[PDB]
Every structure is written in structure tokens, then in C-alpha cells.
Design an enzyme around this catalytic site. Structure first.
Site, PDB file in Angstrom:
ATOM      1  N   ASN A 118     -78.703  54.004  61.280  1.00  0.00           N
ATOM      2  CA  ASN A 118     -77.530  54.514  61.990  1.00  0.00           C
ATOM      3  C   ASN A 118     -77.660  55.978  62.414  1.00  0.00           C
ATOM      4  O   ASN A 118     -78.093  56.817  61.627  1.00  0.00           O
ATOM      5  CB  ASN A 118     -76.291  54.332  61.101  1.00  0.00           C
ATOM      6  CG  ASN A 118     -75.001  54.634  61.831  1.00  0.00           C
ATOM      7  OD1 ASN A 118     -74.784  54.152  62.945  1.00  0.00           O
ATOM      8  ND2 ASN A 118     -74.131  55.427  61.204  1.00  0.00           N
ATOM      9  N   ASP A 128     -83.478  54.747  56.992  1.00  0.00           N
ATOM     10  CA  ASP A 128     -82.029  54.681  56.811  1.00  0.00           C
ATOM     11  C   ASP A 128     -81.542  53.254  56.510  1.00  0.00           C
ATOM     12  O   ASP A 128     -82.070  52.599  55.617  1.00  0.00           O
ATOM     13  CB  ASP A 128     -81.384  55.248  58.085  1.00  0.00           C
ATOM     14  CG  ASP A 128     -79.897  55.494  57.950  1.00  0.00           C
ATOM     15  OD1 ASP A 128     -79.483  56.366  57.148  1.00  0.00           O
ATOM     16  OD2 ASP A 128     -79.139  54.816  58.669  1.00  0.00           O
ATOM     17  N   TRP A 129     -80.544  52.766  57.238  1.00  0.00           N
ATOM     18  CA  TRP A 129     -80.053  51.415  56.983  1.00  0.00           C
ATOM     19  C   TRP A 129     -81.103  50.352  57.255  1.00  0.00           C
ATOM     20  O   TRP A 129     -81.013  49.235  56.747  1.00  0.00           O
ATOM     21  CB  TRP A 129     -78.782  51.145  57.787  1.00  0.00           C
ATOM     22  CG  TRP A 129     -77.596  51.706  57.088  1.00  0.00           C
ATOM     23  CD1 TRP A 129     -76.858  52.794  57.452  1.00  0.00           C
ATOM     24  CD2 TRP A 129     -77.046  51.240  55.850  1.00  0.00           C
ATOM     25  NE1 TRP A 129     -75.879  53.036  56.514  1.00  0.00           N
ATOM     26  CE2 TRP A 129     -75.973  52.095  55.521  1.00  0.00           C
ATOM     27  CE3 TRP A 129     -77.358  50.179  54.987  1.00  0.00           C
ATOM     28  CZ2 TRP A 129     -75.204  51.925  54.360  1.00  0.00           C
ATOM     29  CZ3 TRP A 129     -76.592  50.007  53.828  1.00  0.00           C
ATOM     30  CH2 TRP A 129     -75.528  50.880  53.529  1.00  0.00           C
ATOM     31  N   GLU A 134     -86.936  58.592  54.572  1.00  0.00           N
ATOM     32  CA  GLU A 134     -85.503  58.881  54.586  1.00  0.00           C
ATOM     33  C   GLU A 134     -84.735  57.570  54.497  1.00  0.00           C
ATOM     34  O   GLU A 134     -83.980  57.189  55.399  1.00  0.00           O
ATOM     35  CB  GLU A 134     -85.148  59.647  55.858  1.00  0.00           C
ATOM     36  CG  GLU A 134     -85.460  61.132  55.756  1.00  0.00           C
ATOM     37  CD  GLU A 134     -84.509  61.840  54.817  1.00  0.00           C
ATOM     38  OE1 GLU A 134     -83.289  61.792  55.082  1.00  0.00           O
ATOM     39  OE2 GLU A 134     -84.971  62.433  53.819  1.00  0.00           O
ATOM     40  N   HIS A 143     -83.466  64.320  58.630  1.00  0.00           N
ATOM     41  CA  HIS A 143     -83.231  62.891  58.430  1.00  0.00           C
ATOM     42  C   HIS A 143     -83.913  62.026  59.492  1.00  0.00           C
ATOM     43  O   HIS A 143     -84.697  61.140  59.165  1.00  0.00           O
ATOM     44  CB  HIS A 143     -81.738  62.564  58.415  1.00  0.00           C
ATOM     45  CG  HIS A 143     -81.459  61.099  58.264  1.00  0.00           C
ATOM     46  ND1 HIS A 143     -81.788  60.395  57.125  1.00  0.00           N
ATOM     47  CD2 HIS A 143     -80.954  60.192  59.133  1.00  0.00           C
ATOM     48  CE1 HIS A 143     -81.502  59.118  57.299  1.00  0.00           C
ATOM     49  NE2 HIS A 143     -80.996  58.967  58.510  1.00  0.00           N
TER      50      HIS A 143
HETATM   51 CL   LIG Z   1     -74.619  55.883  57.665  1.00  0.00          CL
END
Ligand SMILES: [Cl-]
Ligand SMILES: [Ca+2]
Ligand SMILES: [Ca+2]
Length: 294
Positions: A36, A106-107, A130, A270
Site C-alpha cells: 500500500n 509491505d502488504w 520493508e 519504506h
Molecule cells: Cl498500510
């Protein structure tokens, strides 16, 4: 760097919806999964390094990139479980085989780690950066973004994200060290140009992060793959970041205990793919060359 996407977007129907993805080359898959509020576009300058090393795939999560939106959308839509159902079906439809190399962020890492745990025999290697490697506490969340994410996880989230597109316009640039170009931001905001539910995925995601025990279902899922990954002998590539953001402190300490893992450090916060794409691509390609020797 370059703002041009990698390859052409392909479309396939899943659960009555249309999902977009990149699929270039032949052989065993090297699967890149964004988080995201990005899309397959995040890997555009990284996937090239793996040219000829396998079938290069990058899927757009449902409601993101060029994938269909889930109408009617609302506070209950785009939860982790729903994204998993669509991604699972998409990956099944792609006929990936049993020697898959996952590259996650991330996700995309929460989804990828969970998928790997559930299809461990088909996973040849896992490259991550990350990531959401385990359930965390607020003390583990980056201090500079702590208040904002707590706000996302409150009634103020709708105005912040659905109305003002804060995740795309504020968080995204704020976690990239180098200045993005007009075209690059255009590509990132494209799926979220319209105010309202079109941006729901970027608000539902932060509300799904396993923090301080909530939400319970994602916490359990993360607890599960965290335990598994800490014991799995599957080869891993941990691309650490400096200063980094999410994968720092306790989580980084945890990730560094994972077996059969190679680690390198690249510059970035990130969304490190926008700061050190060549270092990242080079490392992944080398990782794959070792996993797929002549
Ligand atoms: Cl998020
Ligand atoms: Ca084979
Ligand atoms: Ca910046």
C-alpha cells in the site's frame, strides 16, 4: 531511474472481477508483490535485472493499480482476508508451477508470506524488504508516522484518505528519499484520482496492520507465518534499508534470526524501490542465479 512501466498490463477475470498484472518471459516465476498504496509499477526498475532468469510477474492487488474496484465499497471492504481470496485465485489462475521465487514488500509481504506458508512446497525462495514480518506494538511503529497511522485507524481516517488521498499524496512521497517526477506520481495516483471509495483500499490497509493485537485475525495470520519463517529452511534474501522504516528495531531483530538468509543493506526509508532499484534488482537477480544454477 525511469518512469516507464515494465512490459504491458494483462487482464484476467477472477471472482467476477478483472485483475491486472504483468507477465513477461518463460520458466519458473519470479513473483513481485507490491503493497500500500502502490501497484505493479513499484517494481518497474527492478524486474529488468531478472531478465531471462524466469517468468517475471507483478500483480495489481484488487482495487489497486489497473485491477477492478470492489463495488459496493465501504468500511468492510478490502480487508486482508478479501485481498487474499482474490490474490490466491489470481496466482492459481496464472499456473505458477512449483518452484516460485517470491519478491515482496509491505502488504505484499504479509500476503506473500502467508501464501508461502500455505504452499511451502512450491516456494523456491523468498526475497523481502520493508515487510510486515510479525505482529507489532505501537512502540515498534516508526515514531514520525505513529500519530498519522493511529488517525487512519480512527474515525478521522475517512476524511484523511477518502477525501484528501493522504496515503498516496503524503505518506508515499514522505517515505521516499529522492524526489519523484511528475510522471511517477501520476502513475501512483492514477488508480485513486477520484475522491471517495476508489481510495478505500489505501485506508483499509493501514486498519489491517497487526498492531497491539488488532485486528485479531491478521495478528493470528502474521503470528503464524512469523513462526514458520523463523524455522523454514527455504532460502531467503533480506534486503535491509538504511534508515529504513517498518523493518527496523524489534522486527528487524526478528527477521535477522531467520534461517538460510542472505542480507544486504540499501539506501531508503519504506518505498525503497524508488531509492535503490539497481542495488535491489542486482541482489534479487544474484539470489535467483544461485537458486537456479545452470
Ligand atoms: Cl498500510
Ligand atoms: Ca519444473
Ligand atoms: Ca520524499
Amino acid at each position: 531511474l525511469g518512469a516507464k512501466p515494465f512490459g504491458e498490463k494483462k487482464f484476467i477475470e477472477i471472482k467476477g472481477r478483472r485483475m491486472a498484472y504483468i507477465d513477461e518471459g518463460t520458466g519458473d516465476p519470479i513473483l513481485f508483490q507490491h503493497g500500500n498504496p502502490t501497484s505493479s509499477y513499484l517494481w518497474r526498475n527492478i524486474m529488468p535485472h531478472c531478465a531471462g532468469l524466469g517468468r517475471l510477474i507483478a500483480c495489481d492487488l484488487i482495487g489497486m493499480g489497473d485491477s477492478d474496484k470492489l463495488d459496493p465499497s465501504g468500511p468492510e471492504r478490502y480487508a486482508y482476508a478479501e485481498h487474499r481470496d482474490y490474490l490466491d485465485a489470481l496466482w492459481e489462475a496464472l499456473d505458477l508451477g512449483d518452484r516460485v521465487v517470491l519478491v515482496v514488500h509491505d502488504w505484499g509481504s504479509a500476503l506473500g508470506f502467508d501464501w508461502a506458508r500455505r504452499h511451502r512446497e512450491r516456494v523456491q525462495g523468498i526475497a523481502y524488504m520493508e515487510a510486515i514480518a510479525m505482529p507489532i506494538e505501537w512502540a515498534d511503529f516508526p515514531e514520525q508516522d505513529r500519530d498519522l497511522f493511529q488517525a487512519f485507524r480512527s474515525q478521522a481516517g475517512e476524511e484523511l484518505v477518502l477525501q484528501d488521498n493522504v496515503f498516496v499524496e503524503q505518506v508515499l512521497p514522505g517515505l521516499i528519499l529522492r524526489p519523484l517526477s511528475e510522471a511517477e506520481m501520476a502513475a501512483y495516483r492514477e488508480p485513486f484520482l477520484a475522491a471517495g471509495e476508489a481510495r478505500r483500499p489505501t485506508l483499509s490497509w493501514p486498519r489491517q496492520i497487526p498492531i497491539a493485537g488488532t485486528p485479531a485475525d491478521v495478528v493470528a495470520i502474521a503470528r503464524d507465518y512469523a513462526g514458520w519463517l523463523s524455522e523454514s529452511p527455504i532460502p531467503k534474501l533480506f534486503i535491509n534499508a538504511e534508515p529504513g522504516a517498518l523493518t527496523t528495531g524489534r522486527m528487524r531483530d526478528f527477521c535477522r534470526t531467520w534461517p538460510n538468509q542472505t542480507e544486504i543493506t540499501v539506501a531508503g526509508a519504506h518505498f525503497i524501490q524508488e531509492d535503490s532499484p539497481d542495488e535491489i534488482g542486482a541482489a534479487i537477480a544474484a539470489f535467483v542465479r544461485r537458486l537456479r544454477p545452470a
